Design a protein around this ligand. Structure first.
Ligand SMILES: [Mg+2]
Ligand SMILES: [Mg+2]
Ligand SMILES: [Mg+2]
Ligand SMILES: [Mg+2]
Ligand SMILES: [Mg+2]
Length: 87
RNA sequence: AGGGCGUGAGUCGCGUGUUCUAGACCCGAAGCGGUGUGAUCUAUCCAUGGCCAGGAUGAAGCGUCGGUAAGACGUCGUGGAG
């Protein structure tokens, strides 16, 4: 998250070239952040405050995915298929 | 002074009684000491071999599925532990 791969993620998950805040981009960014924080917590199992931040990110991503699936179910399926298949 | 002790037959053989030192009239311990013999029984150990019909039970592990942010965990199969 030195903004390099963040911009990369924004551009390769954007719906249109100017898109930077749509639910797809938000879910992609949140998933990358959840992965990074999961690794950090695996290193530091005792970081309860960061784990709470991780849970907040998880819930936010869940609500965004719920909105996406409520609007366009096939788009939701494609997005989650790209993003870890929702296991 | 009074008193104690003292004022010629012995000695050597043989026999014999008792006795001394020797096992000492004879028999009998449990045990003590010295030096050896034994681990072909048995106790433990050491090296090197053998052996344990048959039938049960179903531990880890692994895998599937479910679960989760990752899990834990659940489920099923597999597995064959003591
Ligand atoms: Mg004595
Ligand atoms: Mg002795
Ligand atoms: Mg003796
Ligand atoms: Mg000997
Ligand atoms: Mg022997």
């Amino acid at each position: 998250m030195d903004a390099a791969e963040k911009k990369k993620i924004i551009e390769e998950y954007a719906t249109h070239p100017g898109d930077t805040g749509s639910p797809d981009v938000q879910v992609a960014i949140l998933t990358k952040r959840i992965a990074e924080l999961t690794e950090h917590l695996k290193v530091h199992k005792g970081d309860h405050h960061s784990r709470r931040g991780l849970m907040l990110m998880v819930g936010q991503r869940r609500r965004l995915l719920n909105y996406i699936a409520k609007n366009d179910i096939e788009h939701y399926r494609e997005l989650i298929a790209r993003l870890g298949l929702r296991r």
